[PDB]
Every structure is written in structure tokens, then in C-alpha cells.
Symmetry: D2
Subunit: 301 residues, 4 copies
Amino acid sequence: LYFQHMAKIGFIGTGIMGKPMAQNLQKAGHSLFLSTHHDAAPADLLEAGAIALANPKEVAQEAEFIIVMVPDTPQVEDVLFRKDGIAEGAGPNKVVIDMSSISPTATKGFAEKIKATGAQYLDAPVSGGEVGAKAATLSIMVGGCPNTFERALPLFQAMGKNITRVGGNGDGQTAKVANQIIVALNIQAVAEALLFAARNGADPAKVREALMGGFASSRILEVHGERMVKGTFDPGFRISLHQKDLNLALAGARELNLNLPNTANAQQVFSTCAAIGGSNWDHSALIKGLEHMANFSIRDE
Amino acid sequence: MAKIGFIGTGIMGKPMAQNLQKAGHSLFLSTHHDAAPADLLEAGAIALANPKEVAQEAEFIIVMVPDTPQVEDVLFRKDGIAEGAGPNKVVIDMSSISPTATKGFAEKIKATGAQYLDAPVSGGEVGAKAATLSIMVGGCPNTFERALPLFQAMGKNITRVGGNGDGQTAKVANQIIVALNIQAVAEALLFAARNGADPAKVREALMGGFASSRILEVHGERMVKGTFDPGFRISLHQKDLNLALAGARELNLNLPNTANAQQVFSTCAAIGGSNWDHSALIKGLEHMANFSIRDE
Amino acid sequence: MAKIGFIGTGIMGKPMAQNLQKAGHSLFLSTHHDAAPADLLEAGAIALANPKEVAQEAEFIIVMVPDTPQVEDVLFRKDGIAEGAGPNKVVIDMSSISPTATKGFAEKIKATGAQYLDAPVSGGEVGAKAATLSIMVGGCPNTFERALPLFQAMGKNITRVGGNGDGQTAKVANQIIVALNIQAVAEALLFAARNGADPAKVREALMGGFASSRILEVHGERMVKGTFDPGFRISLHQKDLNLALAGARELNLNLPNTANAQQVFSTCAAIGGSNWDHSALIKGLEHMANFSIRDE
Amino acid sequence: LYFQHMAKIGFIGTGIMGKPMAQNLQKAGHSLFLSTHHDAAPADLLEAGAIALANPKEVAQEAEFIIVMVPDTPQVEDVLFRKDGIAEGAGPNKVVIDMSSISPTATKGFAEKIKATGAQYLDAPVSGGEVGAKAATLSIMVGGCPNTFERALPLFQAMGKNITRVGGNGDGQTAKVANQIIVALNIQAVAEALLFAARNGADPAKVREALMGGFASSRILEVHGERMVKGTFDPGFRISLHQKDLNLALAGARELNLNLPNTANAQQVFSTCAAIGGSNWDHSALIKGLEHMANFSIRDE
């Protein structure tokens, strides 16, 4: 309830997701604090009043909330615990919110190390992509203390639509890995289906249009399915990043004794995509690896 | 408007036939296989001896039986649909059968003067009752336009994919997505529960994002709640996946997820689950991990 | 000793029949399908019009044709083996066909007074020529003992697995191992070559250890040297894997490696390889990695 | 040729493989030097004249050749580069021979760091198991300088039968990963086949006996195949260790863009084995996970 008042929020990682999320936080009337350590602060954010400090430590000192939107597990560790990082600037009454898609197992240790400074920790990765981040319609899956979650909820509301506390620390990251298994497999599912249909001489565009509103309907079918048919593979979410995400699921499966045959196989098909020069294609281009495997394309190009 | 015949008034047939009556259509049932549903009789449907006498009377004849042999038999056996079909009549196969055989059945039906549409559906018993099924159709555009108002009374998203066989192909493609989407939710929820997270909260958390699907909404809820009473039985989906895998072998396709999904349904069948709803694919993966996402 | 009939003197049949002559057996060929190999004729083999006249003359009738329908036809068609078979005659199916259908064919052959053994082989064209084939047999122990000296002339490791059908089951199991062992060597060599290591040296290095196999020795050498001219064609092994995958679906078995191997052979077929020797499964995996273990 | 003269060889890691290999080196007339840092020297080796020093550094100082037989990649790094490790005791005219089954990619870096001390490096992992180690019939696949290889060849001859220089540093480890892909997949192959045969009512013992001498013949069929039928799963090579090995193949596949569907799937089936309490069963017990998946056992117990 309280954060209808201005909030002091630091934002570490202003990428294709971080920049629109920080922009949306500023539109809800909040004060943004940036780190210029790796990259210069975007002029869009400086114009809206963001204070560009020199490093994550200084950011953690000025701000009450510190959001991290970086690519992977080792980068969160470095940003949190390197010299002049978030832990050195954190203490009581401060909330460190990792919105990156990292290891759930590692997150538990990061949460303990941050809480050892008197600060609180939330793991709140998102779903919805760049389009979702700009629209503030992201699904935010949170892991942490229920009072910390409620305290940070008005901020999550400015960045997303469905916000949910899955459980304690590590759970928000476990919810993002589960998301990542679904996303990658729903893509593989639509690709195999359209490849089968087009191989039998059925127009894949008509097939995808016909499946909407039934048991095969999904956001992947309407979004990725259209990209597969139209060949619009310009990265939204790179195959190299989804391979990083599936590695978390498969590492978890190895440690916790899970037999996930389709998650294991989507990782192999993503490698066919990379082998034909596709690490930086959007993950919808997973169809191109299946087309390579079939010696048949669903497109006329 | 229109007199309609209906062979196969089962779990999907009866509610689809019921919605045709409400729309102002006269129905003609066949009591050769079994007795006509009293609900339909009490509402105006005429019972007839066989699909030939039904075809003779009706201008539109819908078929809804379990597999390719059963469609073949009801179309071309003695006293079947073809014998009573002819000029101006339209045969509509709304069953989910082999796209390959459909082109042959359509050819033989057209040889009587009649027309043929292959219009399988998606949306389960629920969607048939509520008339929100997605109906994928293959056949002549003029023939599709004639049957379109009947399709509108049975479903919501109606679409002509292409010529004859293309409707059945869209259905195989649908069954690949249904099985693989069910396995994605099962693998994802088993990963979550195994990590100590609540699968009920994870399912709720993923709504509105890229992981959003009709499967996460319906079948995902069944996985969390343990509600596996058949809507669509595993033994039936295994038959649907065989159509895809036979077609992939014939057309030189490498579909590894679909192939894995067939092997997983086999584990479900081995542990006593041939008649569970296809959402119980999670039970096969759960067995594979010696760990269930639910209690007791 | 013994008069022997031989239907199917092809790539495997002709050398097996040849070795029976050398052992002191009189052969009876059928010229219904095609002309008798001149090599066999010049060595004493009598040509006859059909498998019935061959069965009438011989006490042992060996069959070696490509699949289940072809065995069914040659056994039970007009002028086939059954018509001329009877008391004291023994039908030996050395083809690799469905274990399921074999029990039915055996039952129908016994109904003539004759006996039946299902004795498929392993060891390729090479092993047939050199008489070192491993012969897996199903049937009556007394019937197996009668045919044993003939088996000894055609192969080296002779074994009765069980009753009728068990020989064919051992062959399906053999084909699962052959395909999966070929894919293990292909995946292993592709991993090695991809890491900049010489696949020729890696194959040599692995001999004598736990990775030692007949496949690493024969098929591994073909993968390194690029010698993919058929011994056993991919389209044939795909049919063999379908027997295993149909049986797994029927018996509620989850065989994920075998299922993956079938999907990989499909990539080989898509890139023009239906007639390559099964060692060219590496070519499918190589295509899947955009990287070949050989040059040019 | 020269090492028909006594050699000074250090042995770091005296496990189920290390102890018989060190014993066989001593029977060829060589001097063994042990480290008592983690474990006490086995009395079998001390009786044959092994000098038990205090740590890998001291061992590298006294011996000309230093063999390492430890479980995995991080343990080789620790043994080679920790305080009082092999690198601190190494210099010119010294050969460090890693016989462990570790990452080929990491090995290249370990080789460079060791060569920076004036010492030479060989990566010579083996195949043949405990039975092979005792019999000195192991297949030794070596990676390194051809002169270093020839110099160390009489020592490899006392420990094994087929010794081969695959290539330069990293290649011996790449040859062991290729070995590990074959071993795990040949086991999965025999298990699926015997499970299929037994499911159809054919005696699996007769089936395995029938397949020998044909295209399905292998060491896995004669060795592991008999264990599958007889249920003798007492560890020779633990499933947990083969899962470590397949992780190297799958990590390599992810980095180098390989689609290896059966290596990926054997890793999932090994997890079913672990899930039912099998991390310490012999890898032949991979059949038990397939039996769990089929709800059917090939045995009467």
C-alpha cells in the first residue's frame, strides 16, 4: 500500500527488458538510480530523472530497492558480491530484487549472503518478453518473505500484470525455470506440428489459424507460430539465452533425479539451430533446426 | 433449414447433435450400432434403421466415430452412407482419422454424386456441450460455405484449411500440440514440485506470460488437483500420435518430441493408465522420477 | 544327407544356399520369382516351377525374403510352401520378420503335418559368405536338433532361444542393438571430430576396452573411411525398428533410444540416404550438427 | 625404450583403478611415490616398496613421472594447482600424466599451466574398469607431445594393452568422452533389447547368448548383458560417475553445437535409476530404470 509514495529504486542491468521496466517504474512516479560501471545510462532514463551513479555499491547506498536484470547466474554473483557491488552498499531496510533468470539453487545462497547484511532478498524473474516489458503486462513470479513481497508489490504492479508470490527465496527462480521448460517445449510442439502439416501439403498459416480457440491454443501459437510461418526470426529472445535457461532445468534434473525427455531433447534441437548459425535467432527459429532435420522448409523463401 | 444425419452420437456426438436441433435443424439418427439418445428423440430426432436410410433422408450427414477403420466401415459397408448418398448430399466426417485414408474416402463419396468435407474438431466434451469447438475443415470452398452455418452452431473458430485431407492433417498437428503441450506442463510442474515449490502456485504464476496456454489452464489444473477422469483417454491419444509418427516415417520427418511423448504415454499405460485423461501423462513422468507433485 | 529347398536366394540367400551344397546337401530352387543363380545350378541345384514343387521334393525348406507379407505370401499362396509341405517336412524361416505373425504362420504350417522353425540370422553378407552368421532359433527342441547340422554349415553361433516366435524376437532385439550401437559410435565419433580429434585414431584407441564391439570394428571403420555402400540399407533397418516400436506400443514399453534412432534414420532418408548402409546414420547426425567427421 | 630401467613414478589417487595400476607399475620394476594428504597409503603398495610422502608437491619433487587418478575435473584442478600440489613440485624433465576422466576443454588449460613450469603434460584416461586395471589390459588413450608419449610408453605398457596417442593435449580426454558415450549407449541398447525380448516371453539369457558372434556382439553384451540377466549390480562403475561423464559430453555438445539425442536421453534414464536409489549401482543397472519405466522386470526376483 505505502509505495503509492515515491520509491528509491536502483536498476542494475538496463537491457531490452531492463530499460522498459525502469521506464515504467519512472512513469509510476519512482526515482531510478543507475550504475555507469559497465555501460553509460540511457538518455531516455536520464531525461525522466534517473540519477546515474558510478557502481552497484553506490546505487545500493542511495536506494531502498535494488533491482538486478542481468543475463545469467555468474553475472548476478559478480554484480552482487564483487568489490563495489550491491552487497557492499546494502544493509537494513533495503530490498535486493533479482529479476534475472538464474539458478534457483544458487539463489538460495545469494539470498542468505544478502540477508547476512541486514537486507532483504526477493527473486522475481518475469515472463512476457520485450513486448511484455514495454506494455507492463509481464508475469512476475516472486520468491521471498511475504512482508518483503507486499512491501515491493506496488513496484511489481508498475512493471507487470500477474504478480504472484510462489514461495520463499529460490521459488521465483524455480517458477521461471518451469516457465522456460514450457516456452521452449511449446515452441518445439508448434514447430513439429506445422512441419508435419506443411509436409502433408496443408498451408501452415491456415493450420495455425484453425487451431486457435481449441485445445492447442496458446500465446506461443499466436506469437511464435506466426513468426514460424512468416519467417520473422529477428531476436526477441535469443536461442543462446534459452539454451542457458534449459541448462538450468537440465542441471536441476541431474541433481534432483528427474527424467525430462522433451526438455533434454529441445536442448539438442537448439544445438542444431546454433550449428546452422542460429544462436542469435529468436527462439521461434527452433523450427529452422527441425526443417534442417527434415530437409524441408515450411516457407517459400 | 437443413435435414441432418448423425452417425456416432457418443461423448462428442450427442452434444454436437443437440446443438444442431437448438439451431433449427431436423436430425436423423441410426439405431444400427446402438439405441438413439432419448434426449435427441424427445427433442424431434427421427430414428432410422441404418446410415443408408439416414443418408437417403438427410442432405447433410455428419460422422463421429473413433478411428479410420470405423469411418471406412460406416461409409462403405452394406447399408452404409455411400449407398443412400448422392447428388446434392454432403458427407461430413468430423472424426479424427488418418489424413491419408480421407482422400480415398472422399474420392469414393464423390463418385456417388455427393460432396465430402473432413471437419475434425478440438475442445473436448466441454467445448462440444458449450458449442465453442475449433472446427478445422478440408474440402471444396462452395461445399464448406454450404455447411458453414451448421459448423457455426457446433463451434466457434471455424476454418477451411484446404482441399480434402487438410482438415484431418490440421487435427494430427492439433494432437501433436495437445500431447506435447501436456508434457511441457507436466515436465515444468514436476521440476517445480521437485525443487520444493508449490505446483499450484507455479501454475497460477505463469498465467498471462509466454507459457500461457489452454493446456496450462485446463490440463495443468488437473495435474495439480489430481483430477484424471477421462475427457480424452490416453489409449486414444496414443492412436493419434501413431498417425503422426507413421506420417513422419513416410515423409522423412524427424519429430523427436512427438516420438518421446509416445514412449511416455506407454509408461502411463504400463502403470495402469490407458483410460486416464491425457493430463495424467504427468503420472508417467512422476513414475520416471519416483516423485509425485501431489500428496496421499 | 538331406534334400533342401530354398526360397529367397538373394544377397543373403545365395551364399547360405552355396554353403549348404559344399556341406553335401542337395538343393531345390524355385524359379517363380526370378531365375535361379547359375552358380548354384552349375553346382548341382535342381530348378523347380514354384515353392510347392520344392516343398514336395525337399525335407527341409528354407525361406529368406524381405518382410512379413512376403513370408506370408510364399508360405500360404496358391502353389506356395504349405501346399507341398506335410509330415516329416520342416519349414525354416530365416527371414527377419514380425515375431507376432510367426506364431500364426507356424500354427498353420504345423496344421499340414510339417514342422516349423523361425531361424533369423545376424552378421551381414560377409558372414553369410564366410558361414560365421549367428543363427537365433525358435521352435521344438527335436525339430531344432534335426536342422542343427544345416545351421552349422550356414553359421557359427547357433542357439535355440525358445518356442516358435522366440527366434524372431531375438532378431528384433538384435536390430535394436545394431541400430543403437551404430548411433553410439556415430555420436561418439562426431563428438571426437568436433573437438578437433582424429576419428580414425579415436576408433583405434577404443579397441580392447569397454567400448569394444563388432559395430565399432566394422561400421565404425565405414564412418571414418566414408564407405557407405549398402550391406544393410537404411530403409530396411527402419522397417526392423518399426517392428520393435510397434511391439513396444502394444506391450507398454518405453524405449526412448530406439524411438530416437528411428527419427534419426528419417533424417538420413530425407537427405537422400534410404539406400545407404545403416553405418551412414552418422551422416544424419552430421547433418544435425552441420559438421562431417570426414573431408571433401 | 629407456624405461626398461627403473622409473620414479608418483601416483596421486589410489582408488579401485589407481591401486591396481600402481601395483602393476611396481611389478614392472618401478619406484612408486604416494601422497598421504587425503588418505593413508595402502599397505599392499608400501610392502612392494612405495615411498609415502606427505603431499602431491613432495611427490612431484621426488618423481620424474606423476600420474593422477582422481574422480573429476575440479579434483584434478585442486590436486594440480592447490598449495602443496603437483604444479608447485614440478619443473623441467618431469611428466605430469592425468589418467582421470575429466573435461577435454579444461585439460588444455591444465596442460598450458603445467608446461609453464618447464614440465610436460599427458592426458591418458583408460577403458576397461577395475577388472581391466588388475589384468593390465586397459585401453590407454593418450593426448600430448609425441616424444613425451614415447618416453612414458613403457609405463603405459605395464598398466594396459592397447596404448594409442590420439593427438595433442586434450585428445586423450576427448577419446575417453567418446568411449563414455559408447559405453553408456551400448548399455542402454542391450537393456532396451533384453527388456523387449523378455516382454515378449523370450528368455533374456538365451537371447543374449544367441546374439554373440553377430552384428550385435560387444564387450558390453558379454559383460554388462550378463549382469542385467543375473541381477549382479554391485558397483564396478557407479551410475553417479557415468552421469558425471555424460555431463562432459553434453556440455561439449552444448558448446560445440551437437545434437546427440541418445547421449542426452541416456542421461535422463540414469536419473530414473538415481530416483529409485541407484546412484551407487553399477551402470549395467541402467536396465532397472527401463524396467521401472515399463512396469516389468526381466528377472524373477
